[PDB]
Amino acid sequence: PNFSGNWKIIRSENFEELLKVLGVNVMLRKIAVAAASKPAVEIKQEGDTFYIKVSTTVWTTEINFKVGEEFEEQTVDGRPCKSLVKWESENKMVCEQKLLKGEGPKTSWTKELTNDGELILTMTADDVVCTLVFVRE
Ligand SMILES: *C/C=C(C)/C=C/C=C(C)/C=C/C1=C(C)CCCC1(C)C
Numbered sequence: 071p072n073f074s075g076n077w078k079i080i081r082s083e084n085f086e087e088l089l090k091v092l093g094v095n096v097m098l099r100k101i102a103v104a105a106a107s108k109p110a111v112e113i114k115q116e117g118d119t120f121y122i123k124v125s126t127t128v129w130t131t132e133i134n135f136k137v138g139e140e141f142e143e144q145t146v147d148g149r150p151c152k153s154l155v156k157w158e159s160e161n162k163m164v165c166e167q168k169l170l171k172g173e174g175p176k177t178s179w180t181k182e183l184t185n186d187g188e189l190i191l192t193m194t195a196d197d198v199v200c201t202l203v204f205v206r207e
Contacts (some may be wrong), residue, residue, distance in 0.1 A: 152170055166178050
């Protein structure tokens with residue numbers, strides 16, 4: 071469907087647990103968690119080509135990809151990764167991430183627009199799954 075739109079969060083899960091697995095210490099986790107509790111997402115979709123803007127009060131991230139086409143972004147703790155997105159349904163894409171330099175936990179994300187209009191993205195580090203639920207602003 072149309073992932074395109076401006077999205078605001080309504081529900082979050084396992085986000086502090088995600089930063090724990092990535093090795094962010096406790097005081098930092100709590101602070102970052104609260105200060106990134108209301109991230110703003112903007113998506114412009116053009117077929118299989120995607121633009122995503124994720125933004126907190128002082129930070130913003132820009133992501134651009136074509137489905138099927140290898141590109142470079144960063145992990146959640148800021149590490150360089152080669153990324154590949156593929157479709158898993160009409161509503162859902164999956165991205166596998168490969169660290170450009172070095173080793174660490176297995177990272178991936180998914181993006182799913184439900185039929186009832188929720189944008190669900192999940193973020194994964196090893197066996198930990200962070201879920202963020204958004205609706206259109
Ligand atoms: C298609 C939807 C995507 C690719 C969503 C990606 C989500 C992020 C890149 C999350 C970014 C965040 C920050 C930049 C600050 C910390 C809070 C996060 C994890 C939401």
